[PDB]
Amino acid sequence: SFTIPGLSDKKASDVADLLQKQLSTYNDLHLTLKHVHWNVVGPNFIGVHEMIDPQVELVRGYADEVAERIATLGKSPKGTPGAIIKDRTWDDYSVERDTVQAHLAALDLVYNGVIEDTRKSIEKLEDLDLVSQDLLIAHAGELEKFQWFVRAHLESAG
Amino acid sequence: SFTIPGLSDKKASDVADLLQKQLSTYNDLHLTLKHVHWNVVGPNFIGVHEMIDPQVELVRGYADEVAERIATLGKSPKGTPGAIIKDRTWDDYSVERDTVQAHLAALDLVYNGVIEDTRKSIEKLEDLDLVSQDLLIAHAGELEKFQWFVRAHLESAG
Amino acid sequence: SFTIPGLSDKKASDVADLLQKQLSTYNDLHLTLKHVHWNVVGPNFIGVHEMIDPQVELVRGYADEVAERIATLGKSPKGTPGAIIKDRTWDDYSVERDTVQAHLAALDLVYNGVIEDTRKSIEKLEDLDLVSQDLLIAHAGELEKFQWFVRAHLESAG
Amino acid sequence: SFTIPGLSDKKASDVADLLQKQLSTYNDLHLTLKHVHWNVVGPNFIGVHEMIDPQVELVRGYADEVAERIATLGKSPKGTPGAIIKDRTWDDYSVERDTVQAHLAALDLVYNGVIEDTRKSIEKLEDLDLVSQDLLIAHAGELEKFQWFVRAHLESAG
Amino acid sequence: SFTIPGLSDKKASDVADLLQKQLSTYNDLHLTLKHVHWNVVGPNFIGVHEMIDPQVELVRGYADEVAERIATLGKSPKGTPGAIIKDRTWDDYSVERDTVQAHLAALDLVYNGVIEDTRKSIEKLEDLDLVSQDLLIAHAGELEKFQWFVRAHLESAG
Amino acid sequence: SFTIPGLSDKKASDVADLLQKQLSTYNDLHLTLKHVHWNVVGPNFIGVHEMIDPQVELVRGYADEVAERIATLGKSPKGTPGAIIKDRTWDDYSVERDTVQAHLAALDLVYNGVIEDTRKSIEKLEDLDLVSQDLLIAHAGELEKFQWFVRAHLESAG
Amino acid sequence: SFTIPGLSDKKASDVADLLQKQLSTYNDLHLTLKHVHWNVVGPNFIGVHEMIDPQVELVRGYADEVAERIATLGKSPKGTPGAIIKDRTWDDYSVERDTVQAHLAALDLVYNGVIEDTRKSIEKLEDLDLVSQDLLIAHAGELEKFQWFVRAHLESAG
Amino acid sequence: SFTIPGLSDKKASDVADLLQKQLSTYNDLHLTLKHVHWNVVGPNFIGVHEMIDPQVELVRGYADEVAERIATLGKSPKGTPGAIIKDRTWDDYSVERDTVQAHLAALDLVYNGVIEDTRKSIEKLEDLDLVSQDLLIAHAGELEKFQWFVRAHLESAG
Amino acid sequence: SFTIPGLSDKKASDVADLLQKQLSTYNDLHLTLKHVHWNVVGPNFIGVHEMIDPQVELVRGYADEVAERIATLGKSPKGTPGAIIKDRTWDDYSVERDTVQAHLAALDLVYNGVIEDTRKSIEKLEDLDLVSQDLLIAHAGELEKFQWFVRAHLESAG
Amino acid sequence: SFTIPGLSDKKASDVADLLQKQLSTYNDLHLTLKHVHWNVVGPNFIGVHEMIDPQVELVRGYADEVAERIATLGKSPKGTPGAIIKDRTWDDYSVERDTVQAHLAALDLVYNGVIEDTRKSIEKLEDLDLVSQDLLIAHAGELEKFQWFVRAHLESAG
Amino acid sequence: SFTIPGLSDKKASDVADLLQKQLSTYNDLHLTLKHVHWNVVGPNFIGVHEMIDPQVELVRGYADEVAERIATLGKSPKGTPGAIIKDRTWDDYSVERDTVQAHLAALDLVYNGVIEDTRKSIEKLEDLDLVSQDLLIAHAGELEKFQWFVRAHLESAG
Amino acid sequence: SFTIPGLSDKKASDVADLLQKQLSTYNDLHLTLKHVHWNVVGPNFIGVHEMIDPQVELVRGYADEVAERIATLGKSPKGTPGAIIKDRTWDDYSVERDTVQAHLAALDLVYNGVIEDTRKSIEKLEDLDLVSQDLLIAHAGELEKFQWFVRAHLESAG
């Protein structure tokens, strides 16, 4: 029944609730990333196929980071196939084996919903815990950037 | 509509169906592993906590391996939070934050069901595809071994 | 008689005074960490013994970081056995050779006083220098986390 | 006039004859791989160009492996430009500088004939030498997989 | 015509304009750094000569960082010798081959103008995009620190 | 007022003048390379995007090399945004965010003017300084090669 | 009183008995290898002397591997100087300091008895446990290969 | 019939006799170490299990060291399962699979007999060969230290 | 229908023709090297066996180098088992499994014809392309050197 | 209530008392080293600044070494800010931010008092424990050496 | 009585004579370099002291290179303290322990005589052996460059 | 006019005189080692050729070690081709290009005179400086050992 020295047992628990969501969000994300890492096919196959691994090994990186943070706060992280399917507010990636274009486009949107939920979770944190914030921010930086990669693959002449 | 040169489009598809199951099995496993990696607590905490990461980075290693194998065969791997919750025949890890003992014991059983399902999938493969077999075997070796680690933490004087 | 281009010679000096405290705090901490790294004994000895080195090589890491920051500001860091025993507001670790439990519990508290003093120093910095803040924050993240490690070694069934 | 303790001087010699074929097969393969590594051109050039080196450094890896195995058996490996052009049952890669598509498609077939000849050589080995089998199998795993890479570059919407 | 999910197409474009400036600032800086890396001469030559490379390989590091961030936002980074000479509000380093003292002193000032422009750009960002802020801050930390190095080479007895 | 033991103070100064040009040429090149590294977009994005970094970290490599050579000769290298915009005889890259094709084609030409100016500078050096030649040659090898990469991305069926 | 999920407590114990023998076999082998690593002398000394270390660091590698496997099965590995001298069916290496030729020839035979005992143990395992087989096979591959090395040092013109 | 230039053919042979003993002592030790590395079981299993490998890879390190030293002296090292069982004056480790406590305690004693025999061999060497002494000393340092590790696992409140 | 900016479409094609020969020469060489790497036997076996790999991993290094150079020029490299057996003007290595002496001597000659053909190709290049020269030269340095190694194995008292 | 097998519980305790002093001596030293690492300023700043880190990471290296040695003996190491300020017989470094010359000179003396106290502690040990001696000696070698570095910065023409 | 295939037994022997001189030149140089590496003293001591090692480990690098080249040619390299003192045409470094300035100035001249003798040996080689030329050139590049380092330590305001 | 705190200005100078000799001894040694590294020829060439480099890079290692020690003491190391030819009491290696046997035998003796001179210098040091002793001892260990290597190449059947 402990907690970080400097946080009201209430603010603390509200942050937890926030991350627990982020965590399930990442677990879906990184599992989905690997999903496309497998079912992508096209002329510029390798390019993308390989481009995903890092973003994956990275998102999973944000999982241990967030969870290990939750436990630190006092609450107990949940990362079983169950907990995830519950906390999420979407339908798992609908694409099977398809073209590069297909996935990237679909992925574009997945990140939209991930960057958005994050941003909100950040702004909401500036009043709760600043630490758990610099943390979430950092992720945004790479999440948003990676998205760019996805997107740069779909543009026209400008 | 291709396939490995030397496999009947039927034997090939039957192997696929087999791995697709294994894959979902691993995804649960490795996600669950990380789950305990987070909610374990006790006197000999670190010991276990750290002991899990490798088995994890390893099981996820068997995921890319199996899936990338399925696609090679012709069928299309499915590794979304959805596909997994469906192909599985159990209830995701029921333990929240608990003692070392607790998890390890619980994990003991999880591996039972994983090693068993595997063994059977191996024997069943000796008639289908020998390659997709040496593959599944290798895993058993480490899966089984790791279990031992878990178990060695629960024994008595002999 | 210089200073960072953008800081009033007063705000600058007030930040210095703040870090100079943090610095002595770390020096005690990391010297103390190594202290227990030596006098710990018990059944799960190695676990802890080894678990400490990183947190140590890390806190000493925050020493060079903070001090090199102070000098940058204009004031002069003080890190002799003297300066530390003075800036501190506690009694150096009272434990000699004792059980794992003993130290970890005692250490739990030491970190309380370190995370607390830090948190306050952060909030107090948002008006002074934002840079010297992202800096202090970052540390909190790992300081707080490590504490968790210590703590996870002391819990019950929930 | 020696041989592995446990193999009839006849079974031994029959395995040799088998590998000696595999070896020349690899030598053609890896030399051919590098061939396209050079004459590929197109929009997604780099992707493929670079994708080939590893499969090459790998096939050449299977050369030393096989040959050093043959010598172990008692017979004498032959790997001169001559020996290869003789043991082979095909016409060296007919493509000069051409598109990505071109080579990959052409390569698809080359691997067909390599995976096929291998598979048969495996099944034929289960009665001769089990060791020289796990060996050939392993290769199949990567050979077959790489082919997939080639192929994934040629598919449609499903 | 896209943008980060959570930023008004206006706030987004205003941040871009801000970085685009920073970027040209860095390009001048790092090109200038290397400039002195070449024309420095004196008794304690090596010391400085070598001290610069890291700060260089680092500033160029902040270039890719900032620009790849701008593109992510939607606008298009400009980093040609042209774009830079335009966005800047100073006269390129006036020193040719000269003493250590000479450059360092001159460099002192260059950093003044870089840290200042940065600080302002940070404060101005707290209302626009927090992500693009933690980013700029981080740089300040090292920029400011390095300056210290330069400066520590010019002091008296206190 | 020194110089390499074996070079007439005149030949020496004429070589300097030659490199000083090369240097500014590289600085434009490498800055431009990074420019496209940022504004490229298309289906085979990653491929190219990543393909550029090495050639960049390499050209910047030829910068330190050439300049540090000039200083060795006696003259003083100039590598400020200024010096470059002056010594050059072209208009900085005209392409903003555009397709892969676009840039590569445009880049094709940029290298034309760089390999040409180089070649000439080599032939002209065989009478001046042989050392400063093997140096320039080496670069040609990689410069020319990289161009090939660019080009291989633009070809037809032969 | 546990065992791998899928093995009859009898088959399991029969495999154990098999490995326990292998293990003592390796321990003798690797201890013996080092023995010659020390007492070899001749014109081509270094060659051999150094050639042995890897095969050694490797056989000891098969020790931990086998034993850790036995424990996994349920029985208890025995690897004391005692257990070994008992399970073995030969007389420890009779050679003291002697020529290169001497040892290698003698070693030739030692490997005969090791590869033979292994082969049999493999064939005998195809009915018991397939895992504990791929394991023993793999070793054969390198054991047999190394022998070749030994042997290649003793041949004539063909 | 040679010897180190500076040692009486008698002193030399007496040192040899001394090391030859040490060597067999180590071989038992390191073989025994691995023995427990396998049969240890308990709650804090991993801790110890892993703690042993280094001390092992280390003692085996002192084997090559000592033996290669003996050969240097002129006599011929003996390191076969035989030689060891003879030179030793004890009964090989009596513990099978048992608790952590069990082994460590038992191991405690084993090291007693190893550090003791060593110490004496050192003092006895100060008159014979100083080199072969700094050598034996060094080992003591780590041997004794490791023992401490074992021991720290068995203590009470002081 | 392109070419290096600075080479007459004729000089360029004449250089190509020259390398294309060198390339086939290397392919034979490195394939032959590995050939002896396998069939060498004798007292000082290891010495040579291992001495070859580097020279091999090196000549294959000169293959990619030369070919990738040819393509750069405009012509299309040919490196199939076919192309090689044609461009060559000798009979592939006639030695099967034989002594160390045998091969080395035979190899001595092979290098004679490779160094000679090279030297000529160099002198012939000083008028064509200087770049494609420094390249060929470099190789000679190591080719010639390695030969020495071969040779040093065959000498008498002087 | 244990101790190294071969040391009288009295000699053992007398050695402890000796090291415990050394330890506090090092802790001051290394903390002081870092102190100057921060407050040094001058023309040849970097030179020294960087020259200190290694000696620091080294002295701290001698801390863990000594302490871990004390515990091995039986007594309990003390390394809190307290214990140190007590065991020492001097006044912590009196220099704040000053010139290079200043510190180095001051440091010269500090090492005098450290090398002296050490030397004496060595001679005094030759009768107590030889192991704890080779240990202290080794340090002297580097301590004394580093001093030289300090000193070489203060000399005249001879 | 052999020689590189393409060199007249006379041209070959004349090149040898040339290198044999270079070699003794380097041996003096690198031995001398280390000489100053030891006897340098001053305020900016470390800077230089450390600056020399690389140039040393590099010149010794040119020794093995040249000699191993001579042997390749047919003649026999001579690198004993004797051979060197003979082939040289100067008096070994006259400086004992002195200031930084002292040595560097003195060294300046030493390199003059080394770069000069080299340059001449290069020009003289363009008619003999081109290979043994690119080799000597390369060295010049770094020799000359390093000299610059030495020199940059002695200049004034321009 | 300084010296290690604890050494009489006389004892100190007598040690210096001792090392200064050792140093010249090493310089001859390591220069000579490389000498044979070049002129060795025979059937088992490579073996030895390569066996020497390490002992060389090692002896040169003992050079910097000893010299940097002398300077520490107060006197000034001398390591020019001159100083060496003077301090030595032998005739530089008399062997030109010869057989493996030749050199090794010759080298055998060289080491005799080096190990002997060393041993004596050690015994003589036990009364002067213990530090400068552990130092010299250490070397003996490897010097003596390496000799063994040389020697093991010359023995008979026992």
Ligand SMILES: [Fe+3]
């Ligand atoms: Fe973790």
Ligand SMILES: [Fe+3]
């Ligand atoms: Fe993958």
Ligand SMILES: [Fe+3]
């Ligand atoms: Fe620092």
Ligand SMILES: [Fe+3]
């Ligand atoms: Fe091989």
Ligand SMILES: [Fe+3]
């Ligand atoms: Fe980038």
Ligand SMILES: [Fe+3]
């Ligand atoms: Fe540079």
Ligand SMILES: [Fe+3]
């Ligand atoms: Fe193990």
Ligand SMILES: [Fe+3]
């Ligand atoms: Fe060894």
Ligand SMILES: [Fe+3]
């Ligand atoms: Fe390539």
Ligand SMILES: [Fe+3]
């Ligand atoms: Fe430690």
Ligand SMILES: [Fe+3]
């Ligand atoms: Fe060499």
Ligand SMILES: [Fe+3]
């Ligand atoms: Fe040194």
